[PDB]
Structures are given as structure tokens and as C-alpha cells.
């Protein structure tokens, strides 16, 4: 299965000169720079989407339906109506607040919500990231409250210490009263990725009824549909079975910007890597014009032996592909090791300079994940070879218009 | 990133 074009012209590349031994080295690192960073760059973007569905998407409520200054009391009839809709899986109520912690002279804003302990597992992956042994001790009526790990970095407390939070006051008339101040205790701290730790706190549903003087009144209903790609249209028709109009929202207006910026870098980093190999393909052009005048005493020989026009063109086409085969395939072998072992590599540079990047204050995570996909390996292999076809076509066209009788032959 | 818009919709 060996052709005259590829394997029979392989011995032409075994040349010998002066400083030509450094030319094959400098034409390999320059073209592998556009492949090695693109392999570890596309695998790092796949790791962001993997941690989005596990630590961001699986912990937030998808749909939220609230009244317009009413304590919603008829939530028993509005539970079976939204459950039998073909496209919404489960539902669970929530009573959100805007309390804050006053313990140790530290100011920190927190969002206190009240859900059911025996119902929160059926619609979200929230208690699957608790730093304790389990979460089965989270019961109602025992004055318990579970706060995040990032809160305790500012409260300077740990598991088993008493906490003092603030509760918004309830009043049937618009009048100001003295705010309440109770003393509770934490039962297990937890972190989610690096972002929702200092902005989350949950209480039992039965404890929220006695703290706010409400019998069986809730404020909102949280659900979860099948696909998260169309969460704006499936939330509009879900609230039309209770009353005329309610407050409708989703995660697109709050956390939907993380999926928007994950596609913008894929249109910039892939566009920048074409310009890297596009300049790196000029080294193949510079070594192909010099290969014409080097083998100028051999093209005119084959024309006397009886070579056609297409035989002379296709020698230098696959000659430049051999220089591109040694550089593009060497970026794949160096790209797998950095992608599969990115976790000790990034941690080694963070303990060198001291000031580590990607802190858990503004970003949604704190570490750099990695997920290597074999579909992007075939995409970068056909891209570096297509740019080598363009670079080795125009010097190959000039190698056939030369005259065999002009040279000393 | 750094492009934060943060506009809601009722």
C-alpha cells in the first residue's frame, strides 16, 4: 500500500548541511506551540462545563414563582397542578429572607431560605456537598441552622459553636418594632464550589413558621424542569394555572451569564490559534523554496527520465507535510500529559509566586479543572494539516514551471 | 470574566 508520492520521497528529507540541524528543531517547536496550548485550552473549557452542572446548576432553583405582596396560604392546591405538567419533574416550597449574622463583631450579608429536609433531596444536589459525615441529623424543631463554609471564615467559628443571627420582623400593620435576636447553633458546615459558600444559609421549614408568626404560609415555589437550555419559556406557562399573573424568574437572569462567556472564549482562543500555526506554516514555506534550489539538480533529471506534470507537483506537497507531521503529532503527545495532569501543574506554580490566581471571591470556582476529549484531538489534527496544505501548495506550483534545459543538465 | 451586565426581568 506504499505509493511513489509519500514513502518513496521520504529519503529526500534525510539531508546534511551546516546549521541545518537546528532548522528542524526550530520548525518543530513553533508549530507545536499552536497545538499544545489549543489541546490544554479546549480541555480546560470542557472542565468548566463539567463543574457548572455539578456545583452551580445542580444547587440553584430553576424556576421561582412568588406572589405580589401576599403571604401565599393556598399552596396546597398549587402543588399538584404544577406536578402533573409534562416537562416539570418535582416542586418544593421556599421562604427566603435577608437576615444577617451578628457574632464576633463581623458584618456579613446572608440569604436565609426555608425548605423541607425530607423533600430537598428529590429536586437538587444541594446536601451532596457537606463537609461532615452526613446530613441526616438536619431535623426541624431543634433550633438548628446550616450555614456555609465561607461564612465561618469571617465569623471565626467552626462546627459545634453557637451562632447569633438577625430575623426580619413581622407585623400586620406598617409599623416599626424592635428586631428579634435569637441564639442558634450550627450543625455541619459545607462548601459548594467557591462562590455560594458565603451567600447561602438554610433553615427547616417548621422553624420558619414559628419565627415569623405564620401558620402554613410560604412565599415561593421552586421546581426543576427537564432541560436547562429553555428555562425561560417553560417557566412562563408553569405559573398560569394558579392565578392571573405572578413574579416569574429563572436562572438565566442570575446565573445564565456563565454559559454565555464559555462560548466567547471558544471563538477567540480557536481564532488566535489559527494565527499561531499560520505564522508557523511560513517556516515550511521558507524551507521549501530552499529545497527547490537544493534539489534543482534532481528535478531536471526526472524530467529526462519521463516524469509527468502531476508527479513533480506532488513531491513537494507531501515533502512539506512530513515537516508538519513531526511537529503537529509532537504537540498531541505533549498535550495529553498537561491536560490529564493539570491539577499538580497549576498547583506547582501557585506555590512558587505565592500570590495564587483564581481566588474564591469573584469567580464561581477556585481550582482549574480539566476534561480531555478525544473529539478535539481529531479536530486539531485536521486543522494543522489543512494549513500545511495551503503553505506547501504555492512553492510546489513553482517547482514545475522550471526549465530542465536551463540548468546544467 | 469581567463583562458583568446583571439586568433582571420580571
Amino acid at each position: 500500500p506504499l505509493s511513489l508520492l509519500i514513502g518513496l520521497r521520504f529519503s529526500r528529507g534525510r539531508r546534511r548541511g551546516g546549521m541545518v540541524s537546528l532548522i528542524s528543531v526550530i520548525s518543530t517547536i513553533g508549530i507545536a506551540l499552536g497545538v499544545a496550548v489549543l489541546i490544554v485550552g479546549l480541555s480546560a473549557m470542557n472542565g468548566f462545563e463539567r463543574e457548572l452542572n455539578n456545583r452551580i446548576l445542580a444547587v440553584v432553583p430553576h424556576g421561582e414563582i412568588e406572589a405580589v405582596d401576599q403571604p401565599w396560604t393556598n399552596w396546597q392546591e398549587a402543588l399538584d397542578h404544577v406536578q402533573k405538567v409534562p416537562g416539570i419533574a418535582a416542586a418544593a416550597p421556599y421562604i427566603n429572607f435577608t437576615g444577617l449574622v451578628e457574632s464576633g463583631a463581623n458584618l456579613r450579608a446572608i440569604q436565609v431560605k426555608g425548605v423541607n429536609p425530607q423533600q430537598e433531596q428529590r429536586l437538587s444536589a444541594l446536601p451532596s456537598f457537606v463537609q461532615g459525615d452526613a446530613w441526616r441529623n438536619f431535623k426541624a424543631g431543634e433550633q438548628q441552622i446550616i450555614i456555609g463554609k465561607g461564612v465561618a471564615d469571617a465569623l471565626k467559628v467552626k462546627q459545634g459553636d453557637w451562632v447569633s443571627i438577625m430575623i426580619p420582623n413581622s407585623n400586620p400593620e406598617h409599623k416599626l418594632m424592635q428586631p428579634k435576636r435569637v441564639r442558634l447553633h450550627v450543625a455541619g458546615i459545607l462548601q459548594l464550589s467557591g462562590q455560594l459558600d458565603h451567600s447561602f444559609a438554610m433553615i427547616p421549614l417548621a422553624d420558619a413558621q414559628q419565627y415569623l408568626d405564620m401558620g402554613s404560609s410560604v412565599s415561593g415555589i421552586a421546581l426543576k424542569m427537564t432541560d436547562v437550555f429553555n428555562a425561560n419559556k417553560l417557566v412562563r406557562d408553569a405559573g398560569e394555572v394558579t392565578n392571573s399573573y405572578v413574579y416569574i424568574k429563572s436562572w438565566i437572569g442570575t446565573y445564565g451569564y456563565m454559559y454565555r462567556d464559555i462560548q466567547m472564549i471558544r471563538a477567540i482562543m480557536y481564532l488566535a490559534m489559527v494565527l499561531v500555526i499560520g505564522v508557523a506554516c511560513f517556516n515550511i514555506v521558507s524551507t521549501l523554496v530552499m529545497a527547490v534550489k537544493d534539489k534543482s539538480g534532481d528535478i531536471a533529471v526526472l524530467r529526462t527520465l519521463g516524469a509527468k506534470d502531476g508527479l513533480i507537483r506532488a513531491i513537494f506537497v507531501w515533502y512539506g507535510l512530513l515537516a508538519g507531521l513531526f511537529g503537529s503529532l509532537c504537540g498531541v503527545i505533549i498535550g495529553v500529559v498537561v491536560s490529564l495532569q493539570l491539577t499538580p501543574i497549576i498547583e506547582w506554580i501557585e506555590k512558587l509566586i505565592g500570590h495564587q490566581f483564581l481566588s474564591s471571591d469573584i469567580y464561581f470556582i477556585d481550582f482549574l479543572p480539566s476534561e480531555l476529549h478525544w473529539l478535539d484531538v481529531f479536530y486539531v489534527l485536521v486543522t494543522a494539516l489543512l494549513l500545511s496544505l495551503l503553505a506547501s501548495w504555492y512553492p510546489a506550483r513553482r517547482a514545475s514551471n522550471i526549465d530542465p534545459a536551463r540548468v546544467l543538465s | 470574566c469581567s463583562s458583568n451586565a446583571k439586568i433582571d426581568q420580571l
Partner: protein, 225 residues
Amino acid sequence: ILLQCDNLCKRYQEGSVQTDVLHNVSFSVGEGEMMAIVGSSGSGKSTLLHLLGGLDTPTSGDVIFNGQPMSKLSSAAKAELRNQKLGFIYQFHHLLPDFTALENVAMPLLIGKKKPAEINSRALEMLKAVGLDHRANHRPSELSGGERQRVAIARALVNNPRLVLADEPTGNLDARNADSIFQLLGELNRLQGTAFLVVTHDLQLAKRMSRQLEMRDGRLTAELS
């Protein structure tokens, strides 16, 4: 009659000046006939050896070889004419150094798209007739200058050519080894009916040929030498 070449005026613009190194050559080439064209050291030799092959354009008339002119044939048809009907022997070691001594002889057979059972068998027959079968799997860089010229001679007579164009067969090898290949060149005229011309600037290296007509600045029909 094989080749009756007429109107061979080559007006090449060598520095915006049309040269007159060849002017109206009415030379006749026969089947199995040995014509030794004796020319000067710089007048018209290598220009004439490149026009009968098909490398350069005839630009005055045509070279009607076997009833087909070069000016009327395409570049692809003239490539098939230089493969199975012609042979090229030079004096500048026109062999590929990236290949071995076996692939240099088998190179016209690999270009013409023949069957692989006939490439290796016919390449060993030409080296055995010359006497280079013991160094068949060698490279043309460590051999002597007199031994590498015999590989390029056996490179031509592979697929039974009709006219072996020879540009100074001696010069790279000695006259003792050039006498051993002359009985091989005479025996192949009785085997396949081949023909060849020996062009030499000297007077003592073309006495064994049949016609001894000379050449004086394009006047190749001058029999007076």
C-alpha cells in the same frame, strides 16, 4: 526511416540576443545506425542533445520522431516519449543521491506505472550485464567516479528505448571501462533494434562508429571532418 529532423534553428534569447548555435539542421536518424557527430568544445553540442529529447522547444520547425512532432505533442505526451522511447546519458553524474543504486536504475520503471513484479527483476538484469550486481544495494556517494557513470548508462536501457541520446559517455570513467560497455551497446542493437549517437569533442574516441560526419556551428550535415 525513424527520425528525419529538419528546421532545427534554435534562437534563444541569451541576454536579449538570439543565438545561432544551431541553424537549419537536416540530419537524418536511422534504425540501428551509429552516427558520431563531432563538434567543437563550445559551439553547439549540449543544445542539440537537449532539443531531440523534448526538454527545449524547437522554435523554428519540429522534430518528427517516429512520425510524431514535438511541437504538436503536449507536455504529457512528450513525457511518455522520454520514458519508453528515449534514453539519456550525460557526463555530470545525473543520478539521485537520495536513492540506492538499485532504485536509480528502477526509477524510469517506477515513473511509468509498471507492475511491481517487473521492477526488481529488470533492475538486476541491467546491473548484471554491466557487471554491477555485487554493489546493487549501495549508495552513489561512496563509489568511484568511474563506477557511478555505468549506473546512469544502465539507467537508460531499461524499457527498450529506440534512441539512446548520449551526451559525452566518456569523461567520468576511463577508456578501458568505456571499451567494455561498447560490446554491450553493440549487442543490444541486435536484440531490440536500438540506436544511439556518440557526441565527442575529441578525435580519438569515435573511430568505432559508422558515420563520422562533423559539425561546424549548426552545420551538422558537413561530412568533412
